[PDB]
Structures are given as C-alpha cells and as structure tokens.
Enzyme design. Structure first.
Site, mmCIF file in Angstrom:
data_model
loop_
_atom_site.group_PDB
_atom_site.id
_atom_site.type_symbol
_atom_site.label_atom_id
_atom_site.label_comp_id
_atom_site.label_asym_id
_atom_site.label_seq_id
_atom_site.Cartn_x
_atom_site.Cartn_y
_atom_site.Cartn_z
ATOM 1 N N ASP A 60 -0.109 5.153 0.894
ATOM 2 C CA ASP A 60 -0.069 6.243 1.888
ATOM 3 C C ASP A 60 -0.413 5.264 3.291
ATOM 4 O O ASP A 60 -1.218 4.750 3.279
ATOM 5 C CB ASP A 60 -1.654 6.949 1.518
ATOM 6 C CG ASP A 60 -1.481 8.293 2.029
ATOM 7 O OD1 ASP A 60 -0.454 8.981 2.504
ATOM 8 O OD2 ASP A 60 -2.672 9.122 2.376
ATOM 9 N N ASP B 288 1.088 -1.231 -0.124
ATOM 10 C CA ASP B 288 -0.036 -0.092 -0.060
ATOM 11 C C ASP B 288 0.986 1.285 -0.024
ATOM 12 O O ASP B 288 2.072 1.297 0.367
ATOM 13 C CB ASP B 288 -0.980 0.060 1.331
ATOM 14 C CG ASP B 288 -1.535 1.373 1.409
ATOM 15 O OD1 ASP B 288 -2.300 1.656 0.394
ATOM 16 O OD2 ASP B 288 -1.520 1.901 2.580
ATOM 17 N N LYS C 229 -9.249 -2.826 -2.824
ATOM 18 C CA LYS C 229 -8.994 -3.516 -1.522
ATOM 19 C C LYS C 229 -10.010 -3.127 -0.719
ATOM 20 O O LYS C 229 -10.518 -1.883 -0.533
ATOM 21 C CB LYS C 229 -7.582 -3.277 -0.732
ATOM 22 C CG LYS C 229 -6.384 -3.095 -1.719
ATOM 23 C CD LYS C 229 -5.279 -2.430 -0.987
ATOM 24 C CE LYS C 229 -5.299 -0.932 -1.007
ATOM 25 N NZ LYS C 229 -4.130 -0.228 -0.347
ATOM 26 N N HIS D 298 -10.020 9.530 5.038
ATOM 27 C CA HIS D 298 -8.717 9.658 4.792
ATOM 28 C C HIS D 298 -7.997 10.608 5.713
ATOM 29 O O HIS D 298 -8.757 11.801 5.539
ATOM 30 C CB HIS D 298 -8.293 9.925 3.531
ATOM 31 C CG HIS D 298 -8.872 8.636 2.412
ATOM 32 N ND1 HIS D 298 -8.019 7.414 2.330
ATOM 33 C CD2 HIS D 298 -9.856 8.505 1.597
ATOM 34 C CE1 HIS D 298 -8.807 6.517 1.868
ATOM 35 N NE2 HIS D 298 -9.884 7.302 1.178
ATOM 36 N N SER E 293 -2.977 0.546 -4.636
ATOM 37 C CA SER E 293 -3.587 1.723 -3.801
ATOM 38 C C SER E 293 -5.072 1.870 -4.337
ATOM 39 O O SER E 293 -5.513 1.533 -5.308
ATOM 40 C CB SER E 293 -2.944 2.932 -4.605
ATOM 41 O OG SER E 293 -3.597 4.176 -4.003
ATOM 42 N N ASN E 294 -5.963 2.317 -3.027
ATOM 43 C CA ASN E 294 -7.232 2.585 -3.480
ATOM 44 C C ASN E 294 -7.503 4.038 -4.054
ATOM 45 O O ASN E 294 -8.798 4.515 -4.213
ATOM 46 C CB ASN E 294 -8.201 2.589 -2.256
ATOM 47 C CG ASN E 294 -8.359 0.939 -2.030
ATOM 48 O OD1 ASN E 294 -8.262 0.103 -2.959
ATOM 49 N ND2 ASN E 294 -9.043 0.609 -0.823
ATOM 50 N N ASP F 277 -1.142 -0.259 6.112
ATOM 51 C CA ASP F 277 -1.450 0.537 7.496
ATOM 52 C C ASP F 277 -2.928 0.371 7.978
ATOM 53 O O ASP F 277 -3.048 0.960 9.049
ATOM 54 C CB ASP F 277 -1.076 1.830 7.288
ATOM 55 C CG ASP F 277 -1.903 2.844 6.195
ATOM 56 O OD1 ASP F 277 -1.997 2.462 5.289
ATOM 57 O OD2 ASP F 277 -2.501 3.730 7.005
#
Ligand code: MG
Ligand code: MG
Lengths: 289, 289
Positions: free
Chosen positions: A26, A24, A208, A177, A57-58, A233
């Site tokens: 961020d 991932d 994800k 976020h 990444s999303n 994370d």
C-alpha cells in the site's frame, strides 16, 4: 543512507547488482483501488531480468489467499501466494514458535482482531480463546487490526496479561492508515498503545520495522540482504525495516512519507530513517532493467 | 524529598505548621467499599485543629454530586461539595477557558466518556457533539474514562483532530485502576494513548500530575502550597503532582504504590517521584494533631 534520487547510470547499476526486490504494497504498488501506473510492468520486467520479487505487508485484516486477490484485481498477474508475507501470517508463525506452555498444552491465544487474522492463526495450528471448548489457559494476547476493539476487550486482554508468563504480541505498530477519501483509520499501533499502557507491558512486535518479518521471510527463501532492495513509502516502517535488515532502501513518494521528512531526518543524523534512494513512483525503476 | 517515615515530634511539627491538607481519595480514604479505619476521624480532627481539607481526584466517571455521595456512604460526614475537585469538573472548566472558536460560536466538544462526565460539561455551559441540533463544528476532543470506548469512536475522534485547531484534552493519564477482587480496569491513560497515537497528537492533560488541577483548585480557595500537605497513594500521579505544585508530599501505603518503588526512585535520584514522607495509612497522621 544519503537520500539520493535514483536515476541514470546509478539506477542501472543498483538494479543490475540487485538479486531481488522486496516491496511494501500500500502506497507503493497501489493506493486503495488504484494501481500505480507502471507498477505491474516493473514486476514483469523484474521477472524477465533476474530477479526475485517478494511482498512484505503489515496487513493483519485478511488472510493470505484474500490478500493475494488484490494483486490480480489491480492488474498484477503471475504471482504466487508464497511470495506474500503479512504480519498476520508471520504473527501466527511467531506464536507457534514461542508458545510458552507445556508441550501439550502450549496453549490458547486471546486475539484482538478479525476473522482473517483468526483464520491464519488456526491454520498455523493455534488454539484461540474465542473458540468452542471440548476453558484453556490463555498464554498469549495478540493485538492486530481490530475494527471491533472495545474497552471490554481491552479489560479482558489486561486480565490475561496479569500472568507474567502470558505473552503480549502485536502484529505491527502502524499508528494509522490513509484512505482514498483523504481520511485516516487508526492502526494497530494505536490499539497496541492502549494494551501496553493498561497492562504495563511492552509488546513483542511481529511486522516491520521489526526484523522478525525478515526472519519469517528467510525461513522460506534464501535472500542476501546486501543484494536486496527494500522498497516502501513509510520511513518509520519500511525504511527502518530495510536498515535493520542490511538492505538497500528505496523510498517511493506515492504513499505516506514525504521527501521533506526524509531530508529532515538526514539533517538530524537519524540515518536509520533515511532511505539510500528515492523515486517519485516505482515506475521510475523500470528503465533500470 | 527523602522518603522519611512520619512520626513522633516531626509529625506534630509538620501537621502543626500545615495550614491545609489535600487528599487523593481512592487508596487513601478508602479502597472500594471499605473506608480506611481511622480516616473519618482524621478528617474530623483536622476540622477541629485549624485546618482546611480539600479532595483532589482523577475521577471522570461520575459528576460531583454523585462523587460526593461516596463520602457520606463511607462514613465521612460534614463535607461540602465545594471541597471536591475531580478531573471531570476541572476538564469542563479548562474547555470553557480554552475553547478555540469565535465568540459565539466557540463551539462543540466530542466526548469519549460517560453520562456523568457529559453532565459536568453541559453544566459548565459546553456544547457536546452527541447532543440534539437546532451540526456544529467540533473544536475539542475530550478523552475521559470511557467504558464504551470503541474503534469507531477512536476513528471519529481522529477525524475531528485532522483539524489542527481542534483541541485534544485528556481528563487524566492513569493507566489502570485496581478493583476490590484484585483485578484491574484500564484507565483513561490507556485510552488517551490510543487517541494520541492514531491522531499523531499530544493531549493537554487536566488531572494530576498536571498542575492545572491546582490552578483549578486555587481559583476557588487560597492555598499556600508551601503550607499544604499532599496525601496520595500513587507516586506518578499524586506525589509528582505535589512536587510540581510545591507541596509537602505524603505517600500512604494503603493504595497503588509501594515503599520499595519510592525508595527505588530515590536511589535513581528521581526526586519528583519521591515523597517527603510516608505513612502506613492516614490513621497514623491523627496523633499529630
Ligand atoms: Mg506502504
Ligand atoms: Mg489514589
């Protein structure tokens, strides 16, 4: 999955065995403008040691060429665009694959989302509801990260979804976020919740923790999940993704989820939200190589 | 609750016993511009026979004086404003009651909603975040029917809710509403879903099926729920409200819910979503008096 602190001999063996690492971004490689110190160096040593690195990444806010820029800017050199998988990119591929219409015409996607998402969709050959006509039937609604979400767009989305053959797709379900200043931004999950509720429908989720992202990745690369590390994370996104894919999962503590939540889920026997290992930051992985 | 078709001797006895009737409005008394034929006449005969009539609506779009206008316009005369309870009116009372701040200053409400909702709140003596300053601390976020909902307002709502002492209140959870032309509009439930998801919080719900509306009603009127009929078209809103309040429930078929859904819930033993009785329209009740 028993949430073990990864170090010493066990670290050398886990990394030794690993054929590849999926990261991932961020909360893992960086937080906003700031790279996690040591992160570029881990990626370098991984290259030198074996050992494939791919990024999952999303993000649905920028198209891949622009998402790739963040790597260089934050001091991660030597990376190829093809190593990066985003929910935007994968949503475009899913729509292309699933597309319910007659063969021409398959047809149009109503998008809740920005210009980067739209650019990815067009590049996959998808026709968009907002675009100039030669008005095509809308056959999918896609909910992405939409900073211009509105009641009006919500209402229009629901109009399209009255057709039970019209697909409902979400890039991801991340609820919110964190930002640099300590504030939050709402995530696609919150917008998807509105669309699902008002339309009475359940979205197909692209990113994800949906295993579709892994399918999207494995289209292009041979990865053996049993030999692949999943590093993230966020327990409910990254770690759950890892378990669903049969990867060894590593929680890093530089992001959203806390060790305490991981340990709480362990005690409640919710093993799909428990990482195999954790590290304070991914810099702790480098000495394993 | 066994979903029985209300007629003949049983109708005369149920209505005979009834001290009062609480009515939902939309889908019951009218659909949009069109009164259900016979509905004004039932209300007249109820007045002549006993028998209290009160109106319970999840509407948060117009203040009570304007909601009252619909009755006259659709041919329901002789009604007093005090007979009408809306989620807007009741939300204002709940906030006044629950209000977490020091005694002055209790303090400000951030409202997702329109001018009619705002007018009700001010009339209950509540201070609103959007209003001219003499910037007060926001101590509640209220989610109502907001035709101008936006990502920006969602983000701001979440900022206020980072304070765990800040209340989160929703006027209602209705997911959507039907319109005359056969289309839908998203409901407050869909906007509440976005706010809850992005903030990670559960809203206090004001309107049906929350029993708070009944508390709000009983503040002003003595009603014996065991002797009161609850008449509605929506199982998950009106009928559930009725059961939670210990009222005898009557589903009318002129609105959202279908007999088939009522019977489905009966078979699945979900008795709180099953009406005691149903009628094709409330005009079928009049011959009971
Ligand atoms: Mg992350
Ligand atoms: Mg109704």
């Amino acid at each position: 999955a028993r949430c073990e602190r990864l170090r010493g001999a066990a670290l050398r063996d886990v990394l030794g065995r690993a054929q590849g690492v999926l990261f991932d971004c961020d909360g893992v490689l960086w937080n906003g403008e700031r790279a996690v110190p040591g992160a570029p160096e881990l990626l370098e040593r991984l290259a030198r040691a074996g050992k494939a690195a791919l990024f999952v990444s999303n993000n649905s806010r920028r198209a891949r060429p622009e998402l790739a820029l963040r790597f260089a800017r934050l001091g991660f050199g030597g990376l190829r665009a093809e190593q990066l998988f985003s929910s935007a990119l994968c949503a475009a591929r899913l729509l292309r694959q699933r597309l319910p219409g007659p063969p021409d015409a398959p047809g149009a996607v109503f998008v809740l989302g920005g210009e980067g998402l739209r650019a990815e969709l067009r590049a996959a050959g998808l026709r968009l509801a907002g675009d100039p006509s030669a008005a095509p039937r809308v056959r999918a609604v896609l909910v992405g990260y939409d900073e211009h979400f509105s009641f009006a767009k919500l209402r229009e989305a629901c109009a399209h979804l009255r057709d039970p053959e019209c697909l409902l797709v979400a890039t991801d379900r991340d609820p919110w976020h964190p930002l640099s200043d300590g504030s939050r931004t709402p995530g696609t999950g919150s917008l998807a919740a509105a669309v699902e509720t008002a339309s009475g429908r359940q979205a197909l989720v692209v990113g994800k923790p949906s295993p579709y992202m892994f399918e999207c990745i494995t289209e292009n690369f041979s990865i053996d999940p049993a030999r692949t590390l999943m590093v993230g994370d966020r327990l409910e996104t990254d770690i759950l993704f890892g378990h669903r894919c049969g990867m060894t999962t590593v929680l890093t503590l530089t992001g959203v989820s806390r060790l305490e939540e991981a340990q709480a889920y362990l005690a409640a026997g919710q093993h799909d939200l428990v990482p195999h290992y954790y590290v304070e930051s991914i810099a702790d992985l480098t000495e394993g190589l």
